[PDB]
C-alpha cells in the first residue's frame, strides 16, 4: 500500500516531531514528504468522521486541508503496528524560515512583511477551521522559492480551538507566552499572537529575543539590529505581558507596518530569484 504507491527518498529531517523523508509518488511523479511518527510518542489522540482513532495531528491536517496554499497539504495516510505514516505536499525547490534566516541574516523588513502576512494569513485559515497550531516558528515555516510562497507545518503540538482555557502546551518554549511560564494557564489566540511577536523580531533580528523563563516573564524587547519604529512598535505590541494588551488578527493586519505587502511571486522575483 504504502510501499508501491511511493518511492522514498533521503531522510530531510528528525526530532520531537518524528522521521521525514523526502519522496515521489509513483502513479505521477508529484514530490511528497513522508512523515513517520511512532506510537509511544504520540500523547494527543483524535477521532475523524469515520470514528476512527488517529493522531491529532491527522484530525487537524484534514480540517484545514483546502485549495489555499499556506498550509502544508495532508494528500494521504496509513497506520502501521506501532507508527502512523503521513503523506505530505513538498515544494520544490524549497527552504524552511530557519535556515533562510541563518543563511541571510536579518531580513530587510520588505521581505519579513511579505512573509509575516503569509504567515498570519495562513494562521488565521487555521483559526478559521477551527484548529490552533501552536508552535509557530521559523522551523515550522517552508519558503517556496519559485512562487515566494510559505506554508505551515508540523501540526503535532496542534489541538481543536477553542475558547476556554488550555492548561497543556508541547509546543516549543522559548516561542511560548508569559502566562504559560508563570501559571501553566494560556488561552489559544493571544498565545499565538505571542509566538508571532517571537518570530517577527526573529525574521528582523536574525534570532529571537528570549532565551530564559526570566526574560520572557520581564517581557523587555531589546533591539540588537536596526529596526524601523513601526516595526518595534507592533513587536513589542504582540509581546505584550497580559494577553488582553495582545493585538487581534485584525488588528495586526491593519497596524501601519502591514501596509502595501508585496504579493507572494513580487517577493521571490525581489528577493528570492
Ligand atoms: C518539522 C517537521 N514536522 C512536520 O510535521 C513536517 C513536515 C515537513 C515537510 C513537509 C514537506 C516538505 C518538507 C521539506 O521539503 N523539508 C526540507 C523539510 N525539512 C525539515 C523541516 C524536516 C528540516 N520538511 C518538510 N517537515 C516537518
Same mark, same amino acid.
Given at each position: ?34 512523515? !513517520? ?48 505514516? $503521513? ?9 524552511? $524560515?530557519?535556515? &533562510? ?13 511579505? &512573509? ?8 488565521? !485559515? ?60 494560556? !488561552? ?7 509566538? $508571532? ?51 487581534? &488578527? ?12 508585496? $504579493? ?8 528570492? !530569484?
Amino acid at each position: 500500500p504504502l510501499e508501491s504507491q511511493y518511492q522514498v527518498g533521503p531522510l530531510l529531517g528528525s526530532g520531537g516531531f518524528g522521521s521525514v523523508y523526502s519522496g515521489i509518488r509513483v502513479s505521477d511523479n508529484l514530490p511528497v514528504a513522508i512523515k !513517520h511518527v511512532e506510537k509511544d510518542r504520540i500523547s494527543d489522540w483524535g477521532e475523524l468522521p469515520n470514528g476512527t482513532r488517529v493522531p491529532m495531528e491527522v484530525v487537524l491536517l484534514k480540517k484545514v486541508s483546502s485549495g489555499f496554499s499556506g498550509v502544508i497539504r495532508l494528500l494521504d495516510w496509513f497506520e502501521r503496528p506501532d507508527s502512523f505514516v $503521513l503523506i505530505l505536499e513538498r515544494p520544490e525547490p524549497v527552504q524552511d $524560515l530557519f535556515d &533562510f534566516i541563518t543563511e541571510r541574516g536579518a531580513l530587510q523588513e520588505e521581505l519579513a512583511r511579505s &512573509f509575516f502576512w503569509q504567515v498570519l494569513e495562513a494562521v488565521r !485559515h487555521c483559526h478559521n477551521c477551527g484548529v490552533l497550531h501552536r508552535d509557530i516558528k521559523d522551523e515550522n515555516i517552508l519558503i517556496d522559492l519559485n512562487r515566494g510562497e510559505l506554508k505551515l507545518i508540523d501540526f503535532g503540538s496542534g489541538a481543536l480551538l477553542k475558547d476556554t482555557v488550555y492548561t497543556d502546551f508541547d509546543g516549543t518554549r522559548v516561542y511560548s507566552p508569559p502566562e504559560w511560564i508563570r501559571y501553566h494557564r494560556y !488561552h489559544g489566540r493571544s498565545a499565538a499572537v505571542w509566538s $508571532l511577536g517571537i518570530l517577527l523580531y526573529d525574521m528582523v533580528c536574525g534570532d529571537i529575543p528570549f532565551e530564559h523563563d526570566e526574560e520572557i516573564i520581564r517581557g523587555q524587547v531589546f533591539f540588537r539590529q536596526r529596526v524601523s519604529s513601526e516595526c518595534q512598535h507592533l513587536i513589542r505590541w504582540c509581546l505584550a505581558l497580559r494577553p488582553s494588551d495582545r493585538p487581534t &488578527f485584525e488588528e495586526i493586519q491593519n497596524h501601519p507596518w502591514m501596509q502595501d505587502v508585496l $504579493l507572494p511571486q513580487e517577493t521571490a522575483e525581489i528577493h528570492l !530569484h
